[PDB]
């Protein structure tokens, strides 16, 4: 029993972290095969707008210091890849896992491996929010820390950390496309409106039911589309997928419509009581996480 926000084991990813130095900048890189990917602001001189094409034009390969622990990698070439640099190095990473790239969508869970000076320091699960930020813990030097999922022995890389907005954290996908369209600039952009991801709240309430927590369960019912009209004026995303809940509705006897009424009620006495020791309306758990933790499958 129990429910905890967990990361998948980080061993396969730890061996891919390198320390990427250029001049006065140092951040982290992801070394796979003979390439290191890292945020392009490692080559930026300092404030105001950076012309990254200029910074690349004035760059000398011999000024990179790239290291895996105490092993230094020779830089062969550099290419821009959106908000990333693709750095060709002279050594293959013999510990490269089988891997793919994937762009995550709002509500999806992945794992952050928080890295400093090219070494893994912490690992924690995160959830992409509706405004394309994650609720992270990153300080200066963390850029390049990768986000990943593990399916069937294949590492799916979906995030490289770029910047902190408020304190929201934003990164790019391994193709160099910034999540949410934010810029990799030191400029005064502000995150989009944060909203609770409702389908994750629904997974979490079903998890609570399964673990014996029922005090919050309403007897009323509300249709998905009527709830959706209310969620948009109440800081909560719309519900669009419900077929994923049929297994839970069958295991608990409680349909989605009763949970949606329950969500509306919890919002009205918000904080009055915890659910499973959590904020009611916790939105960090997906149905997949819940199934794995309740049933092992």
């Amino acid at each position: 029993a129990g429910l905890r926000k967990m990361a998948q084991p980080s061993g396969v990813v730890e061996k891919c972290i390198v320390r990427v130095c250029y001049g006065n900048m140092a951040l982290n890189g992801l070394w796979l095969g003979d390439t290191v990917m890292c945020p392009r602001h490692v080559i930026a001189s300092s404030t105001s707008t950076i012309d990254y094409d200029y910074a690349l034009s004035v760059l000398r390969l011999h000024n990179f210091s790239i290291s895996s622990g105490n092993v230094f990698l020779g830089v062969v070439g550099v290419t821009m890849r959106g908000a990333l640099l693709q750095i060709k190095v002279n050594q293959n990473n013999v510990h490269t896992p089988k891997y793919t790239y994937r762009t995550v969508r709002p509500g999806e869970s992945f794992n952050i491996l928080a890295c400093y000076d090219g070494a893994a320091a912490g690992v924690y699960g995160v959830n992409m929010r509706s405004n394309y930020t994650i609720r992270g813990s990153f300080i200066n030097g963390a850029a390049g820390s990768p986000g990943y999922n593990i399916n069937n022995g294949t590492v799916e890389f979906c995030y490289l950390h770029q910047l902190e907005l408020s304190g929201c954290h934003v990164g790019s996908d391994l193709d160099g496309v910034m999540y949410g369209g934010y810029e990799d600039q030191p400029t005064l952009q502000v995150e989009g409106a944060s909203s609770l991801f409702t389908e994750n709240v629904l997974a979490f309430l079903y998890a609570a039911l399964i673990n014996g927590s029922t005090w919050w369960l309403s007897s009323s019912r509300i249709a998905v589309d009527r709830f959706n009209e209310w969620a948009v004026h109440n800081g909560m995303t719309t519900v669009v997928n419900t077929d994923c809940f049929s297994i839970f509705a069958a295991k608990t006897g409680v349909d989605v419509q009763r949970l949606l009424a329950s969500i509306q009620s919890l919002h009205k006495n918000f904080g009055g009581k915890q659910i499973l020791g959590y904020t009611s309306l916790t939105d960090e758990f997906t149905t997949g996480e819940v199934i794995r933790q309740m049933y092992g499958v």
Binding site: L27, L163, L165
Partner: peptide
């Protein structure tokens, strides 16, 4: 808005 801080890079890194």
């Amino acid at each position: 808005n801080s890079m890194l």
